[PDB]
Amino acid sequence: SMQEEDTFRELRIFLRNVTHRLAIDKRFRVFTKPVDPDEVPDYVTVIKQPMDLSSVISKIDLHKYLTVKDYLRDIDLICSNALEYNPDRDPGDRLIRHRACALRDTAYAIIKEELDEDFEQLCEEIQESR
Ligand SMILES: Cc1nnc2c(NC3CCN(CC(C)(C)F)CC3)cc(C(=O)N3[C@@H]4c5ccccc5C[C@H]3C(=O)N[C@@H]4C(C)C)nn12
Numbered sequence: 001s002m003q004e005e006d007t008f009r010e011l012r013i014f015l016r017n018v019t020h021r022l023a024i025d026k027r028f029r030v031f032t033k034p035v036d037p038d039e040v041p042d043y044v045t046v047i048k049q050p051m052d053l054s055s056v057i058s059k060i061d062l063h064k065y066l067t068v069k070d071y072l073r074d075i076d077l078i079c080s081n082a083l084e085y086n087p088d089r090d091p092g093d094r095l096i097r098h099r100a101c102a103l104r105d106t107a108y109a110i111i112k113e114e115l116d117e118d119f120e121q122l123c124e125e126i127q128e129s130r
Pocket residue numbers: 029030031032033034035036037039040081082085086090091092093096
C-alpha cells in the first residue's frame with residue numbers, strides 16, 4: 001500500500017542520515033569506499049562479501065533494506081570483514097579492527113537512541129507479510 005511505501009521511504013531517509021553521520025567521522029574514512037584490490041592486494045580473495053558505507057548508500061537507494069535489522073546486517077559485515085582480514089597483533093591491523101568495532105558500536109548506539117521500536121516493528125511486519 002501507499003502507507004507502507006511511506007513507511008519504507010521514512011526508513012530510507014533515516015538510514016541515509018545515520019550512514020552520512022558515520023561517513024563524515026574521520027575515524028571511519030577507510031570504510032567510506034570499497035577496498036581497492038591494487039592498494040590492498042590480498043583482500044578480494046579472502047573477503048567474499050565486501051561491504052562499505054558507499055555500497056550501503058547504494059543499497060538504501062535501490063530499496064534493498066526494508067528493516068533496520070537488514071541495514072545492521074551490512075554494518076556488522078563491514079566490522080566482521082575488518083576483523084577477518086586484519087587478525088594480527090601488528091598496530092596497523094589493531095587500528096583497523098578498533099575503527100571497525102567503533103563504526104559498528106556507533107551505528108548501534110545511534111539506532112538505540114533515535115529509532116522508535118514500533119517503527120522498526122511496523123517495518124518487520126510489512127516485510128514478513130510480503
Ligand atoms: C576496510 C579495510 N579493511 N582492512 C583494511 C586495511 N588493512 C591494512 C592492510 C595493510 N596493513 C599493514 C600492516 C599493519 C600489516 F603493516 C594494515 C591494515 C587497510 C585499509 C585502507 O587503509 N584503505 C585506504 C582507504 C582510504 C579511503 C577509503 C577506503 C580505503 C580502503 C583501503 C584501501 O583500499 N585503500 C586506502 C589505502 C590507504 C590503502 N582499509 N581496510
